[PDB]
Each structure stands twice: as structure tokens, then as C-alpha cells.
Design a protein around this ligand. Structure first.
Ligand SMILES: N#Cc1cc(Cl)cc(Oc2cc(CCNC(=O)CCl)ccc2Cl)c1
Lengths: 402, 548
């Protein structure tokens, strides 16, 4: 029962972002949700003298509908305000718990409330949207975990003392809990924390394993009968890897193609070339030494559709300096589609990025903008939203990262 | 004092009220301001103010006579408000009602109070002739007409006023747009007339006057360029000008009217006309029309000659969209629930780049319908599309970009959408392997394209005013001309590789259009890439050939 003064950055106005059109199904769910939030004092209706807007979406996360607010623009403008454990990637198991309901016990600075304004859209612009602002700390705003921080440390301090090796990291609405324990013990220690949080009034309605995460090695084929095309493709891929690994050579392999040869012609692999290829296979095993994470610089994720439910990704801050690379695969379940797989992959990459570095990456998404803006909420379960942009240039690097 | 509650209003932080000066006025106009203002003063809309008010805003008279005020300075000084009704409803989204009344609200802004603390900033001065005596000072107590916050604060106030009536009458549908009010019910016209008279009284109890000549508007309603009948809607008649010469301004207004007609007139095309605005130097520049542009406008003129009507929306029946190709990169669609009664029509012709294919454009068209359907009806329709699942599944599976395919059904209404060609995924045996390459000096801008094959053939065609990129396409084109029906090409040009791998069937480039014609005629084509200047097979030989 005491507010914490919240200030936007100097010379910065609040967010004025467009509310996206919603289907009548999602509008109805937002109206039910906000009517009950109004009854509980968490939000209140606002008048025309409030010009600010932050977008809202309806997702499922389950049968019951849920509200998600895109506080990205407010988060940039609130920024300022006022700790990431480097060992969370080390732990064999990491479990994620949603602790976001706890924020709704804390009043928000009455002066800052205006910047939390949101609009439930209308169909066909028939009616002006229903407009609310927040009276309590909103889920999804970077300020809410920062303000709730002290209360969180009080509630966790018992549990941390009893289990000193377990690592607990808070990012937005989620708690990341890591242990090197066996899985059954891990899940038991997790339930103790849930009951500890629930005994103290924090309602907490996903298991990762960063032990298995790596940067994938570049893979070269192994063929019984090579052709001119196969050598050319192999010489093309090794040339690309030469920008990254210095020791690659293609002289012996390219000699096998000397002359003007038909592409389908079979080229026996001479011993000198086979050694150079075998040597180049060993160089790809050992990673680059110069790849380091600058905290000031932004993380960037690129994603490539490789077909058959496979998506490759790379995370980097500067070109060719890949901090992480990986491949995503989802076994088709009669509902698997390109937008569902991209949206699942985007979340998996973002979670991995949050564990490793404590910030989300900027996404280069291989999808037409409007298709993404239309359908991304149908499969979104995470409680945060990364920045993104839309690649329109096709990769000819698709083969190489596969 | 007023029953309507005021909205608090501040000026932008660090700004004070307007202090614009009052230019002298004709003595005839001063009399009109004196009479209008004493009538306005009697009604409580304005009030004479003491001398200490340091602010002013100019006022004028023009023609009954009216009072006009220039609040531009206060408007630049006033806080921003939540914008109101940027979009307007689309008649195809509205649902049929048995009875519909239109109600205009008179002196709508002047019926709503204004925040007391803000009233000091509205002050204006009625001039005294020759400045012989001090001027008469007035300030507003209601929402001034032309002020920045008047449109939004009135709508908010109107909504709160309307709230009690709508609770007692849940069945009636009330729409608010600007100063108008649209009321509809499915009750008996006598009972509906009764409910309309009740609301007029409830509005009158809050100070809002309503039409007393029964209800002044009668169907059809001329509303925002539309025509609303009890069982049909249509656009207002469109007139396309005829001129010997066309300026940039004339073209922009023409694509505007055609764009507007597209929502109910099936077949409107504006692509070739709009391409004329590419340079867009000034609205005065005269643009020579194109033979393709003149045919497009002629076909549009023929379409506009016949009338068309749209229907209103029934949420009980399904929503269906069909898309038909119009050629030259242009597409058209209709949205309906009954097989020939259309809710709306539309077009789509954007290339989204220099080269595309039909399946990509069809998927983009489906995307534009899907967004528009959500806005208008809050749902996505069923699609009847002129493509077969084998065609679309093959495309979206091999397409590098992720795409959402709605549930659709194949309708066999030619022209069907097909993949005109498909490059090979593996090299072709028994086919000649062409190693192509091109070049052009960047300064001289002259160049050459040549090939070197496994069968031993070599050729070099000379080239003028080209670029390194265009020659790389020329080399690929040359190998398609001088080859049999099956061919393997090998290039070092990532630029050329990307354009062909995209498998376009249409381009703004005549070269790429020629390559496409060759690719269609050929049976099997495999395109392969090699790093340049790395001494790999024929690429080294063709590089030396075109370098000499
Ligand atoms: N000027 C005006 C105007 C503008 C709009 Cl955007 C709506 C409106 O009234 C309505 C229209 C419809 C759609 C069907 N119409 C009819 O059956 C009779 Cl024309 C339904 C309700 C109302 Cl209130 C009037």
C-alpha cells in the first residue's frame, strides 16, 4: 500500500501505438476479461483526455482465454529504472514458472497510470473502442518485476537458504529455476518452491536442459560416388566456411574438376583430395576463438526454413560472429504448419537467449509482414514479446546452414 | 452547473494560452457578432469576461450569418486527445434492420460544457469600430467549434448521455458518427417510432436537439460517398474526366475514384495508370499517357457504365471469397454469403518486387482479403480459389518463406493458376553442361556474355550499355537459346542465381521475361552455382574467355 514513483526518460512521451484489428471471438474474450479486472479494481475506464495507447491481444497459453499486452514501446520509454546469473546455462535442468499474478497486489504510481492505456477494438469501426488504464502493476511491463523485486527476495530468501546450490533468475513474469539434481528431485524441489510461493499468496499456475545446448558444427556429406556437381557444391560450402574457419583448403578438391566436365560425370576422389576433405572435417569440429558477447550490443536471430519441419537459426551480434547456432524440429501432428512452426521456434530461441544472456534477440523473420501480424497470436504462449523485422531476401545460404 | 460532466483539459507542458490579435472588421460584421453573441450569451454558451484575461483568439463573420473563430493557436497549444473515428464503418459490414432512423444533432458542440480552468484560453474579442472604444470580451463555456478537443469530448459526452437509454432498450442499435446518430430496430414501425420519440426526449432532457419534422433523413441515405437502401448499398455515381492532357494531380484524383469504385464495381484496374506517377515530380507536371494506360481507363469506363449494388451482412450465413485473375499482375475478388449477392468487391495488383509468380501473388491476395474481412466482419471467410492443391502445396513446400494457407476449395474457372515451369532439383544426365559468364566495364558500360560447354562449344556475344549484373543474366539467356531441350547451366553470379531460383513468371525486365519464355519451352533445366575466381571446372575457362 505505497506507490513507487515511476518516471519516463527525459523528453519522452508515452506510447501511442496502433491497436490491431481483432476477430469477434478475441474481442469477446477481452471484454469478459476486462470486465472482471475492472470489478477487482485492477483497471479503470479512461476519457478522451488520455491520448496514449498500448496494443492488447487475446491468447490461450489452455481452454481459458488470456490477455497479453504488447508493452514493448512503453518498456523502451520507461527503460531507466534500476542481475543475470552466468551459471543458469550450466545447470542440467531449468524450470520456468509464471509468477506474474503477484504484480496485481501492488498499486502503480497514479501519475504513470495514463501510459498504461489500452483499447479493446471494435468491429468495422462501428463503436469507439473500450479504453482502460491500469491501477496496479501490469504484467509485461519492465517496471513491474523491478518494483516487485524486494518482495520477491523476501519470499524467496527462506527457500534459497535451504537450497543454496539452486539458481533462481527472474525475467519479467517468469522465474527460471536451475538445478544439477536428478529430474525427480528437481521436480520435487520445484514443487516445494511452488508451495512456498502459494503459502505466501503468490499464485503460480516447462522444463529446459541447457546442459545439452551447443553451437552446431558444420557438416559435410559422405558419399560413395561423387559427381562434378557434388564436388562443386562441396567446394562452394567450404568456401563459405572459409570466412569463419581459416584452415579450410579446396585446392586438392578443385583439381578433380579441372577441364570443362559434364555435371553428371562421376569424379573419383583421389587420395590427396580425400585427405584435404578429411582434414577440413576435423577443422569444423573446433569452434572459433574470437566470439564474445558484448552486453551493450543487440542480439540478432536469423531463421531459415529448411523443409520437412526443420528450421535453422543463428544468434549473433556482429556478422559471422555466431554466439549460438541451432536447428529446430517439430514432429507433425496434423496441425503442424509453417506459421505454427516459426512461432514455436521463435519462442524456443527467445527462451534459450533469455537463459544464456538475459535479454531477448531481435528477430529477422522469413515471412511476409502482414501474414505474421495476422496469425502469430494463434500459437503464442510466452508472456513476453521480442522485437522483429521481416526478411524479404531469400537465403541462398539455406543449404550451408543445414 | 450543467448535468453533463466535463473532461479535464490541459495545455501542452510549458505552453500558455493563445494571444493572437484581432484584425479590424467591417462595421456590418461587428453588428452580426454583437447579435449572435448576445443570443449565445443568453443561452449560456459564452460569457463576458473581465479585463485580466490576457488571451485572445480572432473571430470573423461570413455568410443567415455565422460566427467563425480561428483556434489554430490554441489548437497548437492544447494537449493531444484520443483520436476519434479515424476509420469509418463499411456498409457491407452493417446488419439488416427492419427500421432505421437518422438523427442529426443541432448545435451539438455547443450543448456540452467546457472545463472551467481551460475556459480562460478560449477568450475572443468583438471589435469596436476604429478602436474608438474598448472591445467587448467573451469566453466560451461550451465546446468551441473548431477546437482540437471538441470532436472527441463531444463523442465521449454523447456516449455517457446515451448509456441510460440503451440499458432500458437493449434491442435498439445506436451508432454515433460525427454529429449524426443512427438508430435501428426490428420492432413495428409504430413501436419503433415510439422508441425514437422517447430517445429524442431523453436527449432533449440532456440538452440535445433532434429532428422534429418526423425524421428529416429518408432512404436512400447519401452517407460518406455511399448510398444506403433498405436492402442494398452502393457507391455514389462516379464521373471519370475526359482531357487531352493529364497532370500528376489529374491522375491521382483518377486512381482515387477508380479505387473507390473497386469496392462494388468488379473488374476495376488501376495498375498501368498508377505507374505513370512513378517520378511524381509535382502535381503540375504533365504525364504522357501510355497505350496500356489508355486501354485500362477505357475498360474501366465500360465497367462503370452499368450499375452495381452490394448487400448487407447476415451473421447467420457463411462468409465466402472468390479470386479471379485479371492478367498483367492484377487480380480481382468478391465476398458473398449468397452465390450472386455480393457484400463487396476488391482488387490487388502490387508486384512487391521486380519479379514474382502467380502463386505468390494469389497468396498475397488471400492475405489482403483476410485482413479486410477481420476489419469489416471480425472473421475470416471461406475461399474458393482457381488453384489446385497440388499446385499450391508444391509451391508452399518449396517456398523459402513461411506462409499460412487458409482452408479453400478448388473452383475450375479458367484462367487457372499454375506453375509455368519448374527447375530441376538434380543435374540432368545426357544434357550439355553450359558454363556461362558475363562482364561489363563499369566505366565504359560495354560488355559481353559467353558460354563454354562439355561438348566443346564456345561463344561470345558482344554487349552495349549494360552492367555486370545484366550481363550475368544475358549469359544465362544465351545458354537457353543455344541449347537443346535439356540443359545444365553453371553460373558464378549470386544475383542471377537468386532471380532464377525464385522461379518468377513475370518481370519488369524484358530480359528476365525472355529467360522465362525460354524456361517454359525447355523440358528440364538445372541451374548450379560455384564460387567465382576459385579455379573450378568450366567457370575458370569462361571467365578467361569473357575477360579477353
Ligand atoms: N446516414 C446514415 C447511416 C450510416 C450508417 Cl454507417 C448506418 C446507418 O443506419 C443503419 C444501417 C444499417 C444497415 C442496414 N440498413 C437498412 O436496413 C436500412 Cl438503410 C443498420 C442499422 C443502422 Cl442504424 C445510417
Amino acid at each position: 500500500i505505497e506507490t513507487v514513483p515511476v518516471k519516463l526518460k527525459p523528453g519522452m512521451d508515452g506510447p501511442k501505438v496502433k491497436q490491431w484489428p481483432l476477430t469477434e471471438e478475441k474481442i469477446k474474450a477481452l471484454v469478459e476479461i476486462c470486465t472482471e479486472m475492472e470489478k477487482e479494481g485492477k483497471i479503470s475506464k479512461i476519457g478522451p483526455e488520455n491520448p496514449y495507447n498500448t496494443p492488447v491481444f487475446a491468447i490461450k497459453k489452455s481452454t481459458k482465454w488470456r490477455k497479453l499486452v504488447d508493452f514493448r514501446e512503453l518498456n523502451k520509454r520507461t527503460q531507466d529504472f534500476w542481475p543475470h546469473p552466468a551459471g543458469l546455462k550450466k545447470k542440467k535442468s531449468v524450470t520456468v514458472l509464471d509468477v506474474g499474478d503477484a504484480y496485481f497486489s501492488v498499486p502503480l504510481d497514479e501519475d504513470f497510470r495514463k501510459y498504461t492505456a489500452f483499447t479493446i477494438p471494435s468491429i468495422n469501426n462501428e463503436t469507439p473502442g473500450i479504453r482502460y488504464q491500469y491501477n496496479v502493476l501490469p504484467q509485461g511491463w519492465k517496471g513491474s518485476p523491478a518494483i516487485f523485486q524486494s518482495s520477491m527476495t523476501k519470499i524467496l530468501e527462506p527457500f534459497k537458504k535451504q537450497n543454496p546450490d539452486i539458481v533462481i533468475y527472474q525475467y519479467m513474469d517468469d522465474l527460471y529455476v536451475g538445478s544439477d539434481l536428478e529430474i525427480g528431485q528437481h521436480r520435487t524441489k520445484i514443487e516445494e518452491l511452488r508451495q512456498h510461493l502459494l503459502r505466501w499468496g503468490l499464485t503460480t499456475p516447462y522444463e529446459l536442459h541447457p546442459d545439452k545446448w551447443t553451437v552446431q558444427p558444420i557438416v559435410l556429406p559422405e558419399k560413395d560416388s561423387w559427381t562434378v556437381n557434388d564436388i562443386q557444391k562441396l567446394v562452394g560450402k567450404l568456401n563459405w566456411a572459409s570466412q569463419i574457419y581459416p584452415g579450410i583448403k579446396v585446392r586438392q578438391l578443385s583439381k578433380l574438376l579441372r577441364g570443362t566436365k559434364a555435371l553428371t560425370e562421376v569424379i573419383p576422389l583421389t587420395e590427396e583430395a580425400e585427405l584435404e576433405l578429411a582434414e577440413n572435417r576435423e577443422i569444423l569440429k573446433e569452434p572459433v576463438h574470437g566470439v564474445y558477447y558484448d552486453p551493450s550490443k543487440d542480439l540478432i536471430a536469423e531463421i531459415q526454413k529448411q523443409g520437412q519441419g526443420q528450421w535453422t537459426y543463428q544468434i549473433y551480434q556482429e556478422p559471422f560472429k555466431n554466439l549460438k547456432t541451432g536447428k529446430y524440429a517439430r514432429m507433425r501432428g496434423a496441425h503442424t504448419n509453417d506459421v505454427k512452426q516459426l512461432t514455436e521456434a521463435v519462442q524456443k530461441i527467445t527462451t534459450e537467449s533469455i537463459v544464456i544472456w538475459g535479454k531477448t534477440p531481435k528477430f529477422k523473420l522469413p515471412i511476409q509482414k502482414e501474414t505474421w501480424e495476422t496469425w502469430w497470436t494463434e500459437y503464442w504462449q510466452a508472456t513476453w514479446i521480442p522485437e522483429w523485422e521481416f526478411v524479404n531476401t531469400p537465403p541462398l545460404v539455406k543449404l550451408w546452414y543445414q | 452547473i450543467s448535468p453533463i460532466e466535463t473532461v479535464p483539459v490541459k495545455l501542452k507542458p510549458g505552453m500558455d494560452g493563445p494571444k493572437v490579435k484581432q484584425w479590424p472588421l467591417t462595421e456590418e460584421k461587428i453588428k452580426a457578432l454583437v447579435e449572435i453573441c448576445t443570443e449565445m450569451e443568453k443561452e449560456g454558451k459564452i460569457s463576458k469576461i473581465g479585463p485580466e484575461n490576457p488571451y485572445n483568439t480572432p473571430v470573423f463573420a461570413i455568410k443567415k450569418w455565422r460566427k467563425l473563430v480561428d483556434f489554430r493557436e490554441l489548437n497548437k497549444r492544447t494537449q493531444d486527445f484520443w483520436e476519434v473515428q479515424l476509420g469509418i464503418p463499411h456498409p457491407a459490414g452493417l446488419k439488416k434492420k427492419k427500421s432505421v432512423t437518422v438523427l442529426d444533432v443541432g448545435d451539438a458542440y455547443f450543448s456540452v460544457p467546457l472545463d472551467e480552468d481551460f475556459r480562460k484560453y478560449t477568450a475572443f474579442t468583438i471589435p469596436s469600430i476604429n478602436n474608438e472604444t474598448p472591445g467587448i470580451r467573451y469566453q466560451y463555456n461550451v465546446l468551441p467549434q473548431g477546437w482540437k478537443g471538441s470532436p472527441a469530448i463531444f463523442q465521449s459526452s454523447m456516449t455517457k448521455i446515451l448509456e441510460p437509454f440503451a440499458a432500458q432498450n437493449p434491442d435498439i442499435v445506436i451508432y454515433q458518427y460525427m454529429d449524426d446518430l443512427y438508430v435501428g430496430s426490428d420492432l413495428e414501425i409504430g413501436q419503433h417510432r415510439t422508441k425514437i420519440e422517447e430517445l429524442r426526449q431523453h436527449l432533449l432532457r440532456w440538452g440535445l436537439t433532434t429532428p422534429d419534422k418526423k425524421h428529416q433523413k429518408e432512404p436512400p441515405f447519401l452517407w460518406m460517398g455511399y448510398e444506403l437502401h433498405p436492402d442494398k448499398w452502393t457507391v455514389q455515381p462516379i464521373v471519370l474526366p475526359e482531357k487531352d492532357s493529364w497532370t500528376v494531380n489529374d491522375i491521382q484524383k483518377l486512381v482515387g475514384k477508380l479505387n473507390w469504385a473497386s469496392q462494388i464495381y468488379p473488374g476495376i484496374k488501376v495498375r498501368q495508370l498508377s505507374k505513370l506517377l512513378r517520378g511524381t515530380k509535382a502535381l503540375t507536371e504533365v504525364i504522357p499517357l501510355t497505350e496500356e494506360a489508355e486501354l485500362e481507363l477505357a475498360e474501366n469506363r465500360e465497367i462503370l457504365k452499368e450499375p452495381v449494388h452490394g448487400v448487407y451482412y447476415d451473421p447467420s450465413k457463411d462468409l465466402i471469397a472468390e479470386i479471379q485473375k485479371q492478367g498483367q499482375g492484377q487480380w480481382t475478388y468478391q465476398i458473398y454469403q449468397e452465390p450472386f449477392k455480393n457484400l463487396k468487391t476488391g482488387k490487388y495488383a502490387r508486384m512487391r518486387g521486380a519479379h514474382t509468380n502467380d502463386v505468390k501473388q494469389l497468396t498475397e491476395a488471400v492475405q489482403k482479403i483476410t485482413t479486410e474481412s477481420i476489419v469489416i466482419w471480425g472473421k475470416t471467410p471461406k475461399f474458393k480459389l482457381p488453384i489446385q492443391k497440388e499446385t499450391w502445396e508444391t509451391w508452399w513446400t518449396e517456398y523459402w518463406q513461411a506462409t499460412w494457407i487458409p482452408e479453400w476449395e478448388f473452383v475450375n474457372t479458367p484462367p487457372l493458376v499454375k506453375l509455368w515451369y519448374q527447375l530441376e532439383k538434380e543435374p540432368i544426365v545426357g544434357a550439355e553442361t553450359f558454363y556461362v559468364d558475363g562482364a561489363a566495364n563499369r566505366e565504359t558500360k560495354l560488355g559481353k556474355a559467353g558460354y563454354v560447354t562439355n561438348k566443346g562449344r564456345q561463344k561470345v556475344v558482344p554487349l552495349t550499355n549494360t552492367t555486370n549484373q545484366k550481363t550475368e543474366l544475358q549469359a544465362i539467356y544465351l545458354a537457353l537459346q543455344d541449347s537443346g531441350l535439356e540443359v545444365n547451366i553453371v553460373t558464378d553470379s549470386q544475383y542471377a542465381l537468386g532471380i532464377i531460383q525464385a522461379q518468377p513468371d513475370k518481370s519488369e525486365s524484358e530480359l528476365v521475361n525472355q529467360i522465362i519464355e525460354q524456361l517454359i519451352k525447355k523440358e528440364k533445366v538445372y541451374l548450379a552455382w560455384v564460387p567465382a575466381h576459385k579455379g573450378i571446372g568450366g567457370n575458370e575457362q569462361v571467365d578467361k574467355l569473357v575477360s579477353a
